[PDB]
């Protein structure tokens, strides 16, 4: 198909994870950094 699936990546380790003892971060961009949310087929696998 000539395509590449992007993984959960972010330019800051602060917003990669949130403080609730559980799920990870979900903010898109904070000030000038970014967090590209997961779109790969490993959506519900590979525990974090």
């Amino acid at each position: 198909f000539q395509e590449a699936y992007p993984p959960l990546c972010s330019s800051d380790a602060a917003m990669l994870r949130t403080a609730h003892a559980g799920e990870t971060g979900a903010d898109e961009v904070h000030l000038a950094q970014y967090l590209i949310r997961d779109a790969s087929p490993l959506r519900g696998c590979l525990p974090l």
């Binding site: 800051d12 380790a13 602060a14 403080a19």
Partner: protein, 49 residues
């Protein structure tokens, strides 16, 4: 076996962030949490700090 770091100071100024503005305020004109930590607190066998 458990391992625990004591005097670690997060050297990068990006890593020294607060999640909100008024999280742990004091009456002091200098916030006494910018200073590098000198101890560590955990729980006992009975849950004592």
């Amino acid at each position: 076996t458990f391992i625990m770091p004591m005097g670690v100071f997060q050297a990068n100024s990006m890593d020294r962030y607060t999640r909100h503005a008024g999280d742990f305020s004091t009456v002091s004109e200098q916030d006494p949490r910018q200073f590098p930590p000198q101890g560590i607190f955990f729980y006992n066998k009975d849950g004592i700090l």
